[PDB]
Amino acid sequence: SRILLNPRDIDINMVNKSCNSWSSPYQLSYAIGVGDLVATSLNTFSTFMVHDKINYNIDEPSSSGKTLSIAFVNQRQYRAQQCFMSIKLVDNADGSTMLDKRYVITNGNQLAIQNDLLESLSKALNQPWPQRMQETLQKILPHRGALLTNFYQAHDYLLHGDDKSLNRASELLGEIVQSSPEFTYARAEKALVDIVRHSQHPLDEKQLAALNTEIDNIVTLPELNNLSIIYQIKAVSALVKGKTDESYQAINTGIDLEMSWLNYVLLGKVYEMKGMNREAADAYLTAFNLRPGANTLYWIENGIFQTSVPYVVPYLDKFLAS
Amino acid sequence: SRILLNPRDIDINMVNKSCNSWSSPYQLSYAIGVGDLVATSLNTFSTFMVHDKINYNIDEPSSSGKTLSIAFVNQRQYRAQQCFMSIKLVDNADGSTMLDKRYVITNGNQLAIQNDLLESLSKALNQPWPQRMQETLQKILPHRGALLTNFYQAHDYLLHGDDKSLNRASELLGEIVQSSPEFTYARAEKALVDIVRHSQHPLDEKQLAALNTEIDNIVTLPELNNLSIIYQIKAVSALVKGKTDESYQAINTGIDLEMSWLNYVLLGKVYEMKGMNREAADAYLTAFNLRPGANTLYWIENGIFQTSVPYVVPYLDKFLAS
């Protein structure tokens, strides 16, 4: 009956989301973005397997050898005092604390704090960060500090995936693009969001041609070479056009560049389009493993086209019911 | 209470080791070597996590989404007819068979069969093999077919790890080296075995100087560049000399090149030498995850120097008792 702990399997949890009994946007979408970045970085660039459980409200038995916990903590020195962020890495094999950070976030220092956490995690996990990871991080985060809060907000809206959330993400990204023309990645993320929005509410012919021209210009930009986002755009554009082989090629390259819940959802959608439901279900279960919860389920059920969890993904249907 | 299956966690099992109710060397050490190669290849070169349970006699609950089963099957067309090897990959999420092979092994075709299995696994798992993996496989296996059976036998003796087994491995490798001077890897594996044998039964001054000269010549050979074995030799040689920093540097490079149970045992031994028992226990638990059973436990408890599982690795002590 014994379940063996795996020291290279890590869960990320969030505790006390309601610092002031209420939420609470700002520190929270930042923390959600940090959690996603840590999970994606380790999944892509190390032999750790990370389950981002930030969006997962259930506690179940798991073989995770380590747990990274993000908690908001109030010093209670006066009413309505801002919480600080506590981040702890615990080894579940013996209960020891490997990393214990207290972070005060200041609407400006988000990248510096994140960098400190990444440096400390590298030391605690005996895990140097490879060159491609360091280069990628330089390209996928805004360096104008004033824009960070809204960038993290757009990210959280993307995770939610519904039409209203994507509409707001596109708006936020459009503002960032205007404010920071050099931050090419934001232009690419906005095109990805916009193609998905087109699948939700189809553009007229003129607007579609404009979006397609924008995609064409983006995917050839040399500074976005070697980023998963270009391949996500190529994959979603091909899915929309029903070009199955082109989408399959794109998303597998995207996955090499970024092991993320979203890339596995997109691979699932390609497999469904190919008439391969078992392979689709396997990709969707992978996505759910990487980031379990309502956000990933929303994308599985609704992203690009509708997918029946009972029919296409019966293991997950049964799991969710159990 | 639900445990979520992870589609990127794979166990490898062996069924019907006693083809003729008795063992049974030949097909068995080949199958053990194939299992180890598959696990190490996927662990090193993909985002799959593989648990090689070939040496593990217990069935426990696990989150493994897929199981690769090696089984010996007798056609029973006449008494004492040789078994063939059945290899099946099963998806535990739905019970579907992903790969189903029937292999007749002929004292010659071991590499060809293994290549077929690796090609088929690449297709079944949507997992292309990277260039470094293809190059490595060309260097770590003998290409003189007549030597394969004994090479796999030496490998199994290495896994066992006790003094008599290593003595026999060294002998077998010495014969291979004489028969195949070009197969430089065998010379490196023999030096690794021989340094470990020296930790078991120390060589006199003259013989130690000869071994150290041999190590010096081996580690500079350009064709063994980019192979974990050179770093394993460097790490074990430094451990024997009590050079902790040199050993730590070597084994971490070795791990980058090969995610294997043996490299994590060696990292554990370095951490113990550094006075870092918690980090050692974590490395040892990693090794046990990669290849659970008596062989890995033997190396944890006895490799290079003696290690108390109750004191140094209490989680594993308790697990084994539970």
Swiss-Prot record, chains A, B:
Disruption phenotype annotation: Loss of Pcad activity.
Topology versus the membrane: Single-pass membrane protein
Keyword line: Activator, Cell inner membrane, Cell membrane, Disulfide bond, DNA-binding, Membrane, Transcription, Transcription regulation, Transmembrane, Transmembrane helix
Periplasmic-facing ranges: 1-322
Annotated S-S bridges: 19-83
GO-annotated molecular function: phosphorelay response regulator activity; protein homodimerization activity; transcription cis-regulatory region binding
Consequence recorded when altering residue 290 to S: Confers pH-independent cadBA expression, but does not affect the requirement for the lysine signal
Essential for the stimulus-dependent interaction with LysP, annotated site positions: 76, 79
Description of activity control: Activation of CadC requires two stimuli, lysine and low pH. CadC shows an extremely low affinity for lysine, and it senses the extracellular lysine not directly but indirectly via interaction with the lysine permease LysP. At a low external lysine concentration, CadC is inactivated by an interaction with LysP. When lysine is abundantly available, the interaction between LysP and CadC is released, and CadC becomes susceptible to activation by low pH.
Domain of life the protein comes from: Bacteria
Induction: Translation requires the translation elongation factor P (EF-P). This requirement is reduced as the number of consecutive Pro residues in the protein is decreased.
Annotated phenotype, changing residue 11 to A/E/N: Abolishes response to the external low pH signal
Effect of residue 279 to D: Can still respond to pH, albeit with lower activity
Protein name: Transcriptional activator CadC
Taxonomic path: Bacteria, Pseudomonadati, Pseudomonadota, Gammaproteobacteria, Enterobacterales
Name of the gene this protein is made from: cadC
Residues of the full protein shown: 190 to 511 of 512
